[PDB]
Amino acid sequence: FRTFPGIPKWRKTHLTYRIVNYTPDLPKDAVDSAVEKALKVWEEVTPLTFSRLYEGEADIMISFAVREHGDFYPFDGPGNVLAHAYAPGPGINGDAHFDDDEQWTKDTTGTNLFLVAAHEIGHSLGLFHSANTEALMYPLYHSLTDLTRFRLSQDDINGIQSLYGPPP
Template sequence: MSAWVSSGCSHSRKTCRLGALAIQNCPWCVCVCPGALPGICSCLEYLQNFYNLTTTTRSKHSIHSKLKEMQAFFGLKVTGKLDSDTMEVMKKPRCGMTDVHNFRLPSRFTVFTLVTDYRIVNYTPDLNRGSVDHAIHNAFLVWSHVTPLRFTKVFSETADIMIMFRSRYHGDRNPFDGPGRILAHAFFPGPGIGGDAHFDEDETWSANSQGINLFLVAAHEIGHSLGLDHSSDRNALMFPSYTYKNPNGFQLSKDDIRRIQALYGKSMKSRIFSFHPPCQHVHLMIAD
């Protein structure tokens, strides 16, 4: 997820400061002068990280095409221009996994067995250990209650899914970016770090609406660990952008259920169940 930035724009600093109107009509102005508009200078980086734009395909046409692809995915008006709605989406906190994939799931990896273990390697200082344990446990429950999957926590040995909090460069070629935007990333099932989930320690993690809710992000990342890619369904847990939802009454979308059951099958458990994060009773409902 290495970042690259190139202006590719012959416009003057003054022109680049004209605002969204000038940028909308200049596809090359997707990365402009420092101090122009918040988020503009990271547009090329965004398209590279999440839409497979490469340093060898950064022509005006390819940038236009990737912008259209991104806009279509997020349900925006497809213009191929960096308009204000597109910039707003790009500035939102989100998962670090890409939104497009060039592979089919069965040929890319083997999904986990029905009994899978996980380990929390380290803890964020933002929450007490009990709150982290509850958030991660409940995030796994989201998926085990709609599939035959069962998850067991281990405390020392290497687990199928290793969960850790890390900052910036942390050894997997996918560095975090500090507070904001990229919140976490995970790896599809496979050898080595396959299945692991990493959370950006530079975020402020919480058990409520303050900061970033750990349960919501963990449930999303575990979806990746189990083999799901991003969904363009705004109601889906696997939608890439973060939006706080009250865990009390959290509802997994039909899209999430359909896709995870395509990999692992259906659960014989009740469709409605409860769990208990610290300090509150949470009722989790699964959409039929």
């Protein structure tokens, strides 16, 4: 695993998230399911706990956007960058943005929201990119023939526990 330069991290283990808005591509329940599942992957292997805010400023603000959307990294239309998220800290840090010029799916065929979101939360928590081809935090997007076979790698577990420790 790799962390980010200067090893940014949360210095608290109760985190909040807000889903600021929603993609046209999936029902809200499917997006919520992807986000919750994405949070749970990391929750499971750490002392971190998450709760949702429906207003105000949460730690991890999650949103869907296209092209220019208010930060240093405008999205790029269909393909290429699918999403991004910022390392732990205040304001934009911790936030995760999804390119709504992708077509978001819960299936095996398109751009899978759960898999991307789980990866992005890893960033939001302070994991950078892994050299392990099997890791969630590997830099190149792929999916699975069987989404039920998803498992967080030991490399990812090691990385996140390097930041926050194992579960209590």
